[PDB]
Amino acid sequence: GSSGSSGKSIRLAKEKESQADYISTYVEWQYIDKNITQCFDKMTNMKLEVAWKAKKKDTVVQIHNQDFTVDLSTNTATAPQGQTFTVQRLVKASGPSSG
Protein backbone atom coordinates (compact mmCIF):
# COMPACT_ATOMS: atom_id res chain seq x y z
CA GLY A 1 0.00 0.00 0.00
CA SER A 2 1.45 3.31 -1.16
CA SER A 3 -0.17 6.68 -0.49
CA GLY A 4 1.90 8.54 -3.07
CA SER A 5 3.19 12.10 -3.35
CA SER A 6 1.81 14.94 -1.23
CA GLY A 7 3.18 18.34 -2.22
CA LYS A 8 5.54 18.34 -5.19
CA SER A 9 4.29 21.75 -6.31
CA ILE A 10 4.46 24.11 -3.33
CA ARG A 11 7.98 25.51 -3.61
CA LEU A 12 10.41 24.98 -0.73
CA ALA A 13 13.21 26.99 0.89
CA LYS A 14 15.70 24.20 0.18
CA GLU A 15 16.13 24.02 -3.60
CA LYS A 16 16.64 27.78 -3.86
CA GLU A 17 19.51 27.52 -1.37
CA SER A 18 21.63 27.00 -4.48
CA GLN A 19 21.73 30.80 -4.68
CA ALA A 20 23.06 31.40 -1.16
CA ASP A 21 25.36 28.40 -1.58
CA TYR A 22 26.68 29.54 -4.95
CA ILE A 23 27.64 32.82 -3.29
CA SER A 24 28.74 31.83 0.22
CA THR A 25 31.36 29.72 -1.56
CA TYR A 26 33.43 32.89 -1.85
CA VAL A 27 33.24 35.18 1.18
CA GLU A 28 35.53 36.95 3.64
CA TRP A 29 34.91 38.04 7.23
CA GLN A 30 37.24 40.32 9.19
CA TYR A 31 36.98 42.09 12.54
CA ILE A 32 38.31 45.55 13.42
CA ASP A 33 40.09 45.47 16.77
CA LYS A 34 40.54 48.52 19.00
CA ASN A 35 43.46 49.86 16.97
CA ILE A 36 44.13 46.75 14.89
CA THR A 37 42.44 45.19 11.85
CA GLN A 38 42.62 41.40 11.80
CA CYS A 39 40.56 38.63 10.20
CA PHE A 40 38.89 35.45 11.47
CA ASP A 41 40.23 31.94 10.87
CA LYS A 42 39.30 29.96 7.76
CA MET A 43 36.93 27.97 9.97
CA THR A 44 35.35 30.93 11.76
CA ASN A 45 35.13 33.07 8.62
CA MET A 46 32.18 30.87 7.65
CA LYS A 47 30.71 30.66 11.15
CA LEU A 48 29.79 34.30 10.52
CA GLU A 49 28.76 34.22 6.86
CA VAL A 50 26.43 31.32 7.64
CA ALA A 51 24.70 33.54 10.20
CA TRP A 52 24.50 36.49 7.80
CA LYS A 53 22.94 34.31 5.10
CA ALA A 54 20.74 32.29 7.45
CA LYS A 55 19.06 35.59 8.31
CA LYS A 56 20.36 35.34 11.87
CA LYS A 57 20.40 38.22 14.36
CA ASP A 58 23.80 37.48 15.92
CA THR A 59 26.43 34.74 16.05
CA VAL A 60 28.88 33.87 18.83
CA VAL A 61 32.52 33.15 18.00
CA GLN A 62 35.71 32.44 19.94
CA ILE A 63 37.84 35.58 19.74
CA HIS A 64 41.11 35.92 21.65
CA ASN A 65 40.31 32.72 23.54
CA GLN A 66 37.04 34.27 24.68
CA ASP A 67 33.47 33.82 23.43
CA PHE A 68 32.13 36.98 21.78
CA THR A 69 28.73 38.04 20.45
CA VAL A 70 28.85 39.20 16.83
CA ASP A 71 25.74 41.09 15.74
CA LEU A 72 25.06 40.98 12.00
CA SER A 73 22.37 43.66 12.12
CA THR A 74 25.02 46.24 13.01
CA ASN A 75 28.03 44.04 12.26
CA THR A 76 29.80 44.52 15.60
CA ALA A 77 31.25 42.12 18.16
CA THR A 78 30.80 42.48 21.92
CA ALA A 79 31.75 40.56 25.06
CA PRO A 80 30.86 40.68 28.78
CA GLN A 81 34.54 41.38 29.43
CA GLY A 82 34.58 44.89 27.98
CA GLN A 83 35.78 44.52 24.40
CA THR A 84 33.97 45.34 21.15
CA PHE A 85 34.89 45.10 17.47
CA THR A 86 33.44 45.68 14.01
CA VAL A 87 32.80 42.87 11.52
CA GLN A 88 32.80 43.53 7.77
CA ARG A 89 31.59 41.34 4.91
CA LEU A 90 33.66 41.15 1.73
CA VAL A 91 33.00 39.10 -1.41
CA LYS A 92 36.03 37.36 -2.92
CA ALA A 93 35.80 38.03 -6.65
CA SER A 94 38.29 39.09 -9.32
CA GLY A 95 37.40 39.90 -12.92
CA PRO A 96 37.07 42.71 -15.48
CA SER A 97 33.46 43.88 -15.19
CA SER A 98 31.80 47.24 -15.85
CA GLY A 99 28.15 46.57 -15.08
Swiss-Prot record:
Auto-ADP-ribosylated. It comes from the Eukaryota. Coiled coil: none annotated. Induction: Up-regulated by IFNG in macrophages. Down-regulated by IL4 in macrophages. Residues 15-93 form the WWE domain. It is found in: Nucleus; Cytoplasm. Weakly expressed in the thymus during development and in adulthood. Expressed in macrophages. ADP-ribosyltransferase that mediates mono-ADP-ribosylation of glutamate residues on target proteins. In contrast to PARP1 and PARP2, it is not able to mediate poly-ADP-ribosylation. Catalyzes mono-ADP-ribosylating STAT1 at 'Glu-657' and 'Glu-705' and thus decreasing STAT1 phosphorylation, negatively regulates pro-inflammatory cytokines production in macrophages in response to IFNG stimulation. Interacts with STAT6. Interacts with PARP10. Interacts with PARP9 in IFNG-stimulated macrophages; the interaction prevents PARP14-mediated STAT1 and STAT6 ADP-riboslylation. Belongs to the ARTD/PARP family. This is Protein mono-ADP-ribosyltransferase PARP14. It comes from Mus musculus. The chain holds residues 1532 to 1617 of 1817 of the full protein.
